[PDB]
Amino acid sequence: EKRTGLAEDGAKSVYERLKNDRAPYETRAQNCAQYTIPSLFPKDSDNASTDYQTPWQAVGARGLNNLASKLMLALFPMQTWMRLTISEYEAKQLLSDPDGLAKVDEGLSMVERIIMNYIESNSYRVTLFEALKQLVVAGNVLLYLPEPEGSNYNPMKLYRLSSYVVQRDAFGNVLQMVTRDQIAFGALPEDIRKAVEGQGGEKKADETIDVYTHIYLDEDSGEYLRYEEVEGMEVQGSDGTYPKEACPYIPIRMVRLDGESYGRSYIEEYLGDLRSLENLQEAIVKMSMISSKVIGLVNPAGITQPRRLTKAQTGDFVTGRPEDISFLQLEKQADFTVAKAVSDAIEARLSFAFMLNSAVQRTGERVTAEEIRYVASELEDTLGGVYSILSQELQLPLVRVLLKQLQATQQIPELPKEAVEPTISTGLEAIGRGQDLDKLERCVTAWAALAPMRDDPDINLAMIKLRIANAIGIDTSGILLTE
Amino acid sequence: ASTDYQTPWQAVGARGLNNLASKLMLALFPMQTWMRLTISEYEAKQLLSDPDGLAKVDEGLSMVERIIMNYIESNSYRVTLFEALKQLVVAGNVLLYLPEPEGSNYNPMKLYRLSSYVVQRDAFGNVLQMVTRDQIAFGALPEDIRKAVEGQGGEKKADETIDVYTHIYLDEDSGEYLRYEEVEGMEVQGSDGTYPKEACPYIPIRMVRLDGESYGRSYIEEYLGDLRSLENLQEAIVKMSMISSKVIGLVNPAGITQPRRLTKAQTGDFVTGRPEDISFLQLEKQADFTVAKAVSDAIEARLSFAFMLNSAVQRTGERVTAEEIRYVASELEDTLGGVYSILSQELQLPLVRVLLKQLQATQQIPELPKEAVEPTISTGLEAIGRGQDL
Amino acid sequence: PKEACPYIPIRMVRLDGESYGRSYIEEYLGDLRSLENLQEAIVKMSMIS
Amino acid sequence: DKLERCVTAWAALAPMRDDPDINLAMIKLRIANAIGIDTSGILLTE
């Protein structure tokens, strides 16, 4: 009845203590936002009628959205993107019965379809796109998917970097998290209203109430404990025990670093050439505006005078020489050409770096056939390890929390006891279900090349079909007859 | 911890490291089967007769290859291997360690970058000893280590960091490794280990080996200087650009025009002055700018043929698995020197070998004969596909 | 009921802790207005001709 | 595009119904299941 161990002083205390170590990542987030798209991460004061200004450069703004879109095209497509398989007891099972694992395939495809349906229904696509924009501009996002509590609408609560905190060790084991939702008293969950009301004093409807959610490692066991706190007291009937692997609070980092509790954004690594673009581009716009100020210089040594140019109607003769009036130009030409040259040469870097279109995806883009393969292969070509690190950090828990809670609610089908608790694959190993569409297509054409004779003498047919199939990426374990 | 890394002035390095790591992964750990399990020196008894006889052996070994591949896909070795390849290209040494599986639950592979381990060798390359220096919190320790630390004395906080050390050493008696753990100056009870010579779970990987030298030197080291000569030569240019982005209006004092009258005038206001009086300060490095840009380009060309940056090879409609892995590996041995083969001997042999030991020590052995229970392994271009050439 | 509210308030680009929405044109307003000025002049400078 | 290219990939499986040394029941499912097809009424079970 007293929280001990890591949660010794309540959630607000831990949150305010760890906010100091949160702060620099937030500063980086603000800077990256100021150079890319300013609204996407405000400052903590600069809210509510603050008029974000566009950056002088446009490559940042294009680049953040393009990179988030391509990450979403390769990480959460229309297709099945997870894979549910069986290990270390299938050696009992997969030895015999190539007709036996077909029931297991049907059961697991049923489970994959039901997870995908829960994805499409509850609008995880919208919140995941938002989370990817946060994960590219800033370094850290925190997703939380609640208990479903019915088949009604249950979206996923996002947490941008300002409103949560995470402490780690030098591994990357998450020791503790605290979130800092600010909800109105009127729209609270019902149990929390009574817990706040018990503290005392009547409340207005729109008076803001800050909750804090704390998740911590136990001093006793290897499982998480969660509680809520409002105003300095643990919320009654909001206790929680969570297993080690099915933690519903998922903290996501884009680029990890050793012995460091948070993540650093992908835009950070190319920030400087971003800001060097900014300056170099800024000037140009400013230097343009100087050109847009006509000043007529009249030469005092001459004759012509502007009480007579101006008052004359059009096509009126008037007295004067033409060498007297001139106009003030701005003769930066060599500076303008060198500034434009380095501006271009820096946008080229940021275009190969942010996947801006260098004639890859323009020429008649389609869906689902060769497309997701190409997108993911390019996203691992550039971007470093974003697509794989992101797949380990994001998709494993997003399948794992779903697979826990949904099958803890819905129906378990026919499939055996070694496939009730399955293993999950997520990345390029899990796109499609089979290895490669091009493999199966060219393998079928290579089989069609084996037209001429069934019982062709002086040759084999049973092994060479297996060999042409087994040279390309085919399983060859149900594709070919044994007996 | 809040140090704000700065981007380099050149961009060829950044593109190049990621491209090289990606192409190494495309040719070293693809979607396909990438190891090969075969039989030697007793198959001469067996392969003489029964061309229908080795088909059962083929089926058994393809079953074992599939089960190793499944354990690869499930436990996310792809993510940690990509990280390890980026470490192995930028720095010279990585240390992978795959633990005992202890069930079919999630077991990823613990990486160790160069700062946190150490390796002593002889002038062969026999690994004599390794020590790793994981820094784990007291709260998230394994259960046996918590009691070993607690026995040392004093209560501990939850987030108080505890440095373990893992030591692996050659025996003075036999030719097998011995491992132990240590916290705070005492060997951890119930953490003893004896490991066979070939199935060592701690795999130290070097990119480019050198004789009589215990560590590895990165591939970026060999082209570092032309990298840094790019850096400087490029740096200036950006700096020299910024000088151009400072408008200073020089007004000629000998003349008439004066800037209390240019500025206050609205647009299209006549005002007095001659045009030869105001000019603007340019930066007249033009021949220096053209020679600097020329040598910059000519040095990026080298680093592009050196880091496999796109010189119109992989752009024109890239596909998967058919002619692709062959082409990638053949080019990665064309350039890069011996990276693809040295890396295959150092990396893929132990990563198959440790798996093949521990998994088949846990899971089921099929029908196949006694000369194929303990097989031989092929890894590189000899093992891409199963057959020789599509 | 909570889910079938016939009054639907729509925001284009949402922000945290802020009751309204900010338009998509806002984010590119400035380069919009810098076009405006830079273009305005030109038309004015034409008319002098 | 998935259904169209999947139907053409099935049409590539012309030559023989009862073609020896090969399966047909699973490979149609696999070529369909590599691209974005539900495969849950598209293919016969029983």
UniProtKB/Swiss-Prot annotation, chain B:
Keywords: Capsid protein, Viral capsid assembly, Viral genome ejection through host cell envelope, Viral genome packaging, Viral penetration into host cytoplasm, Viral release from host cell, Viral short tail ejection system, Virion, Virus entry into host cell. GO terms for biological process: symbiont genome ejection through host cell envelope, short tail mechanism; viral DNA genome packaging. The keyword Repeat does not apply. It is found in: Virion. It comes from the Viruses. Disulfide bonds: none annotated. The keyword Cell cycle does not apply. One of its GO terms (cellular component) is viral portal complex. Homododecamer. Interacts with major capsid protein. Interacts with the tail tube protein gp11. Interacts with the terminase large subunit. Interacts with the internal virion protein gp14. Belongs to the podoviridae portal protein family. Forms the portal vertex of the capsid. This portal plays critical roles in head assembly, genome packaging, neck/tail attachment, and genome ejection. The portal protein multimerizes as a single ring-shaped homododecamer arranged around a central channel. This is Portal protein.
Curated annotation (Swiss-Prot), chain C:
It is found in: Virion. It comes from the Viruses. Homododecamer. Interacts with major capsid protein. Interacts with the tail tube protein gp11. Interacts with the terminase large subunit. Interacts with the internal virion protein gp14. Belongs to the podoviridae portal protein family. Forms the portal vertex of the capsid. This portal plays critical roles in head assembly, genome packaging, neck/tail attachment, and genome ejection. The portal protein multimerizes as a single ring-shaped homododecamer arranged around a central channel. This is Portal protein. It comes from Escherichia phage T7.
